[PDB]
Amino acid sequence: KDELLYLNKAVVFGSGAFGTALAMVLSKKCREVCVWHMNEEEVRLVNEKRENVLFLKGVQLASNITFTSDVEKAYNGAEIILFVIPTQFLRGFFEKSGGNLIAYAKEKQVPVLVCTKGIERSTLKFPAEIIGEFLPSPLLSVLAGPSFAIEVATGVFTCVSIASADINVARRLQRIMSTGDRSFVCWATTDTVGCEVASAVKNVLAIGSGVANGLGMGLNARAALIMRGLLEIRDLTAALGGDGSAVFGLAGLGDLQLTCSSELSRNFTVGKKLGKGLPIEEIQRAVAEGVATADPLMRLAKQLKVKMPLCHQIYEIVYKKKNPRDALADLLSCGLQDEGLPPLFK
Amino acid sequence: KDELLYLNKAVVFGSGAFGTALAMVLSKKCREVCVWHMNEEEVRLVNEKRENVLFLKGVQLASNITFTSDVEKAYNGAEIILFVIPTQFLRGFFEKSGGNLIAYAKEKQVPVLVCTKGIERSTLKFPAEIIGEFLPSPLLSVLAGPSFAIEVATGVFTCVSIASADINVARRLQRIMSTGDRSFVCWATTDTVGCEVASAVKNVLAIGSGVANGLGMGLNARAALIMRGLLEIRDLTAALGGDGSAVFGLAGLGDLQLTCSSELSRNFTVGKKLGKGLPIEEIQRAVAEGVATADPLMRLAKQLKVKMPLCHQIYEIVYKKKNPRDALADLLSCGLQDEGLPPLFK
Ligand SMILES: CCCCCCCCCCCCCCCC(=O)O
Ligand SMILES: CCCCCCCCCCCCCCCC(=O)O
Ligand SMILES: Clc1nc(Br)nc2nc[nH]c12
Ligand SMILES: Clc1nc(Br)nc2nc[nH]c12
């Protein structure tokens, strides 16, 4: 149905910029929105200032958004649960604080929307996969797309995809997350794996985009990096058993192109400094997502025997002090080739 | 073979920014490069100033690039011929001045590289199709990709695709156009139709990107326009009998994303003014490619029964004084839907 669903309550676990922006979206579709944040002192400040001064400065929270540090109070009564907890803290959160939450979700069959992105170092698994160790996969969906947080939080027109193996789950979440003024529009897809892969890999590729800028390259180069980089997302998705339908959509190409063009993002600045010859040690002052992700990504790639040329070279630049110009030359030493895309039509 | 081909002479018919930049690329692979330009007086100026002050100001031409107004002197001895003549002048050029050129090309089996982009109003055909009425299609290839002219002309890293129905033709052109310093890298593909469609449609979509900016929208919106717009290139390509393998490559997505992000381009400024409420008459002072293209594109789409939502609405805004906010609302009145991309992997 193209008819929107409104709820009494939503909970968002994760208080970053993205989680906060999504809570702003939900505030227009649910009467009450709770945002869980572990530090009580900081919870008080935020509720006082009516603004997430910690991670979304300059944005006034809707009056119906309340921050809390009490997990139980947070989810009680919620009819949709969002996870935006950083990958590295996800598992521990469920083990240490998810017992009742999990029981509640299972009992009430509450939809869960995974918004966290990355790769867990110990298992090489993606966020929805980790969460799926604790919550029934039939209840799980993934949100991904070109969605700069400030724009989303302020209601500037944004499109994203919602992925669920069962398209009917995604379609229902589409009705909850899409806004009445059409400022936040969701598109349904089955490709959960493609979404998670794109969401992690885009951060590594963004460092490369930075490198290209630091090397003195221009916008033609950035476009080429996006397009060739996209095939790496595609190939890794295939190897992971994903259907790949999100690769050339909002979650894949859409988000990748946006993320690689964010010149002020930390991924980009780190790549630019690396491209200018600065060693990673000097740069490291606040870890760029791409830095953290590059290592587990290479390990997963190696484990699955997937060649990811750009990502591999970016990993070398970041972790093995490889000179950026040497990496580029190595990349361009493969000789002349065909583009590597199959025909769509026969 | 990954081994480059060097030539004695190249000719480029068309003296615009792009043709001039491509002549700079060729100057590094051919001893002599002739650029044909119809106005003799302007030819003299350019050769004197050793700079295309007309369409590529600020760039010093290689000493081996010579401008000329003599078609016969231009192609004589050439071993590759590039066309960059504007769509609307292509047919007349062959009819009025191509007799001997055509005989020479046929006799010597000279490769022809089509770089012109657009749709001819009278026949609704694309540039390589028009040229193919005069030169044997086996000799024809198309060059397309994210390739801002200034960057190409100055040797800043650029990747493009070369398309030919027979992949072997494209592969040979790849050896001629790719540079020894790897600053200009070509990728082979069969999808000529996809390239021509993308190259024309991107200009219409760029006006829409402008409109979005003028409406107060942001980068999330631009990313969505690129991604949804790409499906229109895909569907039109299918209807035209193209194989579509270029759609998600450099010629399609790559060039589209670049072109839609060029905020200072005429397509973009025209869209932005339209988005700000200015009527097209007041704007029209130097036609933006997207304006010229929108009409023949809609006619071709209608003729083939292909729905192109964004392009259609852009045509309405440009040609039928439709209010941009009304167009947007109409576009968003389709209800909630699936993303519309097939799985890549089963
Ligand atoms: C970490 C290195 C980043 C440098 C970025 C270079 C700018 C874009 C390069 C795109 C060319 C793609 C090379 C493909 C070669 C291959 O498939 O092995
Ligand atoms: C000429 C209008 C341009 C306005 C541009 C709006 C910004 C991007 C909009 C993308 C949403 C895509 C709408 C798809 C709806 C449909 O498929 O009918
Ligand atoms: Cl230990 C820990 N857990 C969660 Br959940 N989130 C965090 N953010 C910082 N440290 C964190
Ligand atoms: Cl009439 C004509 N022919 C060619 Br070819 N190119 C042109 N450029 C402007 N007018 C032109």
> Residues B161, B19: one domain?
yes
Residues of A in contact with B224 (CB under 8 A): 145-146, 157-159, 185, 250, 254
Query: Phi first, then psi: what are they for B41, rounded to 5°?
Result: -60, -50
CA angle A327, A329, B9 (to 5 degrees): 160
CA B234 to chain centre: 16
> Residues A121, A232: one domain?
no
Which residue among the candidates A9, A29, A125, A202 is catalytic per the annotation?
A202
- Nearest ligand to the CA atom of A92: 3
Long-range contacts of B309-313 (CB under 8 A, 24+ apart): B309/B228, B309/B232, B309/B334, B310/B205, B310/B208, B310/B225, B310/B228, B310/B229, B310/B232, B311/B201, B311/B204, B311/B205, B311/B208, B311/B229, B311/B232, B313/B208
> Residues A52, A166: one domain?
yes
Beta-bridged to residue B185, according to DSSP, are B159
Total count of domains within chain B: 2
Burial class (CB in 10 A: 0-12, 13-18, 19+), B304: middle
> Residues A210, A166: one domain?
no
C-alpha to C-alpha distance for A127 and A148, rounded to whole angstroms: 20
Amino acid at residue number B247: V
Whether A244 and A234 have beta carbons less than 8 Å apart is answered as yes
Beta-bridged to residue A113, according to DSSP, are A82, A141
Whether A158 and A183 have beta carbons less than 8 Å apart is answered as yes
C-alpha to C-alpha distance for A300 and A267, rounded to whole angstroms: 21
Q: Supply the DSSP string of B160-195, one letter for each residue.
A: EEEE-SSHHHHHHHHHHHS-TTSSEEEEEES-HHHH
Q: Which residue has the tokens 């392009």?
A: B311
For CA atoms B324, B327, B329, B335, the dihedral sign is negative
Q: Which residue has the tokens 């790719």?
A: B178
Whether A189 and A180 have beta carbons less than 8 Å apart is answered as no
Which residue among the candidates B9, B29, B202, B272 is catalytic per the annotation?
B202
DSSP code of A189? E
DSSP code of B51? S
DSSP code of B80? S
> Residues B180, B155: one domain?
yes
Whether B25 and B32 have beta carbons less than 8 Å apart is answered as no
Q: Could you tell me the two tokens for B316? A: 């309405």
From the list B156, B223, B250, which residue is nearest A217 (CB)? B156
Whether A73 and A43 have beta carbons less than 8 Å apart is answered as no
**Domain end position, chosen among A198, A223, A254:** A198
Which structural domain, as residue segments, surrounds residue B85? 1-198
Q: Could you tell me the two tokens for A88? A: 């590295």
Whether A38 and A18 have beta carbons less than 8 Å apart is answered as no
Whether A142 and A49 have beta carbons less than 8 Å apart is answered as no
> Residues A50, A147: one domain?
yes
> Residues A157, A251: one domain?
no
Ligand 3 close to Cβ of residue A319 (< 6 A)? no
C-alpha to C-alpha distance for B178 and B145, rounded to whole angstroms: 13
Residue A9 is among the residues annotated as catalytic for this protein: no
Q: Could you tell me the two tokens for A276? A: 């200018």
> Residues A242, A275: one domain?
yes
> Residues A188, A214: one domain?
no
SS percent in chain A: helix, strand, coil, step 5? 50, 10, 40
Amino acid at residue number B176: I
> Residues B30, B171: one domain?
yes
> Residues A285, A192: one domain?
no
Q: Supply the DSSP string of A242-278, one letter for each residue.
A: ---TTTTSIIIIIHHHHHHT-TTSHHHHHHHHHHTT-
CA angle A335, A337, A343 (to 5 degrees): 165
- Could you tell me which of B80, B77, B110, B75 has the C-alpha nearest to residue B93? B75
How was this one solved?
Answer: X-ray
Ligand 4 close to Cβ of residue B38 (< 6 A)? yes
Question: How close, in Å, is residue A244 to chain B by CA atoms?
Answer: 5
Q: In CATH, what number is assigned to the domain containing residue B116?
A: 3.40.50.720
> Residues A154, A293: one domain?
no
Q: Could you tell me the two tokens for A10? A: 């939503």
Q: In CATH, what number is assigned to the domain containing residue B339?
A: 1.10.1040.10
C-alpha to C-alpha distance for A288 and A307, rounded to whole angstroms: 23
Ligand 4 close to Cβ of residue B291 (< 6 A)? no
C-alpha to C-alpha distance for A42 and A343, rounded to whole angstroms: 54
Question: How close, in Å, is residue A109 to chain B by CA atoms?
Answer: 23
Whether A245 and A190 have beta carbons less than 8 Å apart is answered as yes
Beta-bridged to residue A161, according to DSSP, are A144, A187
